Amino acid sequence: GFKQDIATLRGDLRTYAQDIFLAFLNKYPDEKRNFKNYVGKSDQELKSMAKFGDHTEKVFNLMMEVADRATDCVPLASDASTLVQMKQHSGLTTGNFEKLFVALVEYMRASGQSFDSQSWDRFGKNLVSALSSAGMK
Numbered sequence: 001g002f003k004q005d006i007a008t009l010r011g012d013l014r015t016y017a018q019d020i021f022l023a024f025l026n027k028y029p030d031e032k033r034n035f036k037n038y039v040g041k042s043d044q045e046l047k048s049m050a051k052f053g054d055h056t057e058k059v060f061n062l063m064m065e066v067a068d069r070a071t072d073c074v075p076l077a078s079d080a081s082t083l084v085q086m087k088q089h090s091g092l093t094t095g096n097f098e099k100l101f102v103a104l105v106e107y108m109r110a111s112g113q114s115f116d117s118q119s120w121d122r123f124g125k126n127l128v129s130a131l132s133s134a135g136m137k
């Protein structure tokens with residue numbers, strides 16, 4: 001289920017983080033507009049770029065923590081407040097996070113593996129709701 005999925009993802013976090021974040025950027029190419037540097041780069045090149053490797057790992061490191069602290073796929077309000085109040089996320093709306101999670105769920109559906117994709121779908125909507133409540137536009 002959801003908790004085992006966090007363990008599966010953490011077991012190979014660099015590869016899963018890169019694969020899911022590339023799935024997000026390829027599904028929603030307009031999202032690169034938050035990432036000027038990423039324009040005109042294939043996947044294997046993005047994987048070569050420091051701000052990409054670095055961002056992508058910190059994203060999934062912190063998302064796995066938020067997932068781990070959740071009860072029944074409902075994140076802590078504190079984890080939502082902390083994401084909203086990150087200076088780097090100033091330009092972001094809940095729409096950015098929704099799309100990440102849509103891409104994550106699609107990725108899990110398409111994998112060979114017994115991910116609990118419905119739990120991730122709920123986790124994504126519950127995180128979007130929490131972010132709104134904590135003040136994200």
Ligand code: HEM
Nearest residue numbers: 031034035051054055058059060062063088089096097100
């Ligand atoms: C659960 C989802 C996410 C988490 C946990 C997260 C976490 C973080 C963290 C920890 C940083 C700072 C990392 C560092 O300084 O090394 C950061 C920066 C940033 N995040 Fe996010 N992020 C998330 C989703 C997003 C999304 C969906 C976008 C855009 C669609 C985004 C755009 C950025 C940008 C532009 C920066 C700073 C510049 C850069 O990416 O290099 N983040 N994020």
